[PDB]
Design a protein around this ligand. Structure first.
Ligand SMILES: CCOC(=O)[C@]1(CS)N[C@@H](C(=O)O)C(C)(C)S1
Ligand SMILES: [Zn+2]
Ligand SMILES: [Zn+2]
Length: 219
């Protein structure tokens, strides 16, 4: 059996959720997202892989008196978006980029109910920022910045030890995108990847290195 959903406190008002899925050719894959609390309201930064774990995650916070105000998905793959359909059935607002929703639609998947377009977007003004660094892991991948805590959720874009599945990646653009990300958040206290442990801003440097290598390798 797969490991259970985990929820762990990372900082004041910031929790990491980890869910697990068997993915062909990789075996058991962990996926980290966040829950961010603003007063008595909770925001999901990426859904778990499944509806089941999305329900478990929501239930946990609601039973502790936090109202789920919305989710945002950092890219179209189902490790960030698998719970959108269940959230929509419960009338909890879901958010994704215009490009992410276009890629969901193209793949015949449920879309987020709200979309945003542009390089920067405030999900919650002065608290939860979204930034598009450019194509990398996928054409649509965005990151989420919490300015009060100096925490960056890098999602599946942050790849310190190797780039992973390149099926939907843009390996030519990833170094440029990673350099932009490094330049913007070099002062981050914590960087949270989807698929490896939380670190500091060096994860931005290591990601840039791994992208520059992959592009070289591909020739
Ligand atoms: C169905 C689950 O979603 C996937 O298939 C992912 C989405 S990031 N793709 C893989 C990759 O990039 O190698 C992975 C192992 C990082 S998980
Ligand atoms: Zn992905
Ligand atoms: Zn992923």
């Amino acid at each position: 059996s797969l490991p259970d959903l985990k929820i762990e406190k990372l900082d004041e008002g910031v929790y990491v959720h980890t869910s697990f899925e068997e993915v062909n050719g990789w075996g058991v894959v962990p996926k980290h997202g966040l829950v961010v609390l603003v007063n008595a309201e909770a925001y999901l930064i990426d859904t778990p892989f499944t509806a089941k774990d999305t329900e478990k995650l929501v239930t946990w916070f609601v039973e502790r008196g936090y109202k789920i105000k919305g989710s945002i998905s950092s890219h179209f793959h189902s490790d960030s978006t698998g719970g959108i359909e269940w959230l929509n059935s419960r009338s909890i607002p879901t958010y994704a980029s215009e490009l992410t929703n276009e890629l969901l639609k193209k793949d015949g998947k449920v879309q987020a109910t709200n979309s945003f377009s542009g390089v920067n977007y405030w999900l919650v003004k002065n608290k939860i920022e979204v930034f598009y660094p450019g194509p990398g892991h996928t054409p649509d991948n965005v990151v989420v910045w919490l300015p009060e805590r100096k925490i960056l959720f890098g999602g599946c874009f942050i790849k310190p030890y190797g780039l992973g599945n390149l099926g939907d990646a843009n390996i030519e653009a990833w170094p440029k995108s990673a350099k932009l990300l490094k330049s913007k958040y070099g002062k981050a206290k914590l960087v949270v990847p989807s698929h490896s442990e939380v670190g500091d801003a060096s994860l931005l440097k290591l990601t840039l290195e791994q992208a520059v290598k992959g592009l070289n390798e591909s020739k």
